[PDB]
Structure 1
Amino acid sequence: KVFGRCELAAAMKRHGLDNYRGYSLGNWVCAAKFESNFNTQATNRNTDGSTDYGILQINSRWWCNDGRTPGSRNLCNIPCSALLSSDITASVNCAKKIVSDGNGMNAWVAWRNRCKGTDVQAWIRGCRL
C-alpha cells in the first residue's frame, strides 16, 4: 500500500507515535517519506547482507527475521514480511522498540540526514488530526 501523507499521519497518531519518545508526528511522517516514500512494500538490501523492510525500513539484522541475514536477532519477534502489510501495526510496534533502544530516531538514517533539525511540522500541514 502506498499511503497518502495525511492518511499515514492519522494512522501513526492512532497507534501512538505522536510525541512517542518525544518525537512529534511530523518527525515520523517525514521519516516514512524519506525511508520508504510511504510505500509499505518497500525493501532495500544493505551491504552487510541485511535488508530494510516496510514503511519505516526496519532492518533484518536486529529487529525482524527474514531467514537470510547472518547474526539475526529478531528483537521485535516478527517475520520481516509482516512489516510489508497494508496494516502498519507491526511496523509501529517495532519502531517503538527501535526508537527506545538508545539513539532515538537517529536509528533512521534518512530521518537524521533529511528530517532532523528541519521544519517537520510541514509534513502534517492540512491534515485533520
Structure 2
Amino acid sequence: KVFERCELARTLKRLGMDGYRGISLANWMCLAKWESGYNTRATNYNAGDRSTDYGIFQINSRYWCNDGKTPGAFNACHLSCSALLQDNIADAVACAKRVVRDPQGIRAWVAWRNRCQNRDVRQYVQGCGV
C-alpha cells in the first residue's frame, strides 16, 4: 500500500507513535517519506552485505527481521521480514519502536540524519488533524 500523507499520520498516531521515546509524529513521517515514499511493499537489496531493507521504514534484515537469507543475521523484532511488507503497518510499527529502544533511537536510520535531523519537519503533519 502507498499511504497518502495525512492518512499515514493518523494511522501512526493511532498506533502510538506520537512521541514514542520522545520522537514526534513529524519525525516518523519524515522517515517514512524519505525511506519509501510511504510505500509498505518497498524493498532494497544491499549487494554489498547481502541484507535487504523492507517496507515503509525500510528496516534491515541483518538485525531486525528474519528473511532466512542474510548471513549471520539476527531477528530483534522477532518477525518474518514478510510481516514488514503488509498493508497493515502494525507489525512494522512494533518493529520500528523496537529499533528506537536501542541507544541510537531515530538515528538508526541514516536517511533520518540526512533528510530529517535538524530540519523543519512541521510540514509533514500539517492539516492532518494529529
TM range, smaller chain: over 0.9
Deviations 1:28-70 (A, max 9, x none): 0000000011000000012211100000011101000111100
Gaps of 5+ in 1: none
Partner of 1:65: 66
Matched residues, number: 129
User: Which amino acid in structure 1 is aligned with residue 103 of structure 2?
Assistant: G
Pairs within 5 Å for 1:105-116: 105-116=106-117
In 2, the alpha carbon distance for the partners of 1:29 and 1:13 equals 10
Gaps of 5+ in 2: none
Partner of 2:3: 3
Query: RMSD over aligned Cα, in angstroms?
Result: 0.7
Deviations 1:58-108 (A, max 9, x none): 110100011110011111110001101000000000010101111011111
Question: TM (normalized to structure 2)?
Answer: 0.97
- Partner of 1:26: helix, strand, or coil? helix
- Partner of 2:26: helix, strand, or coil? helix
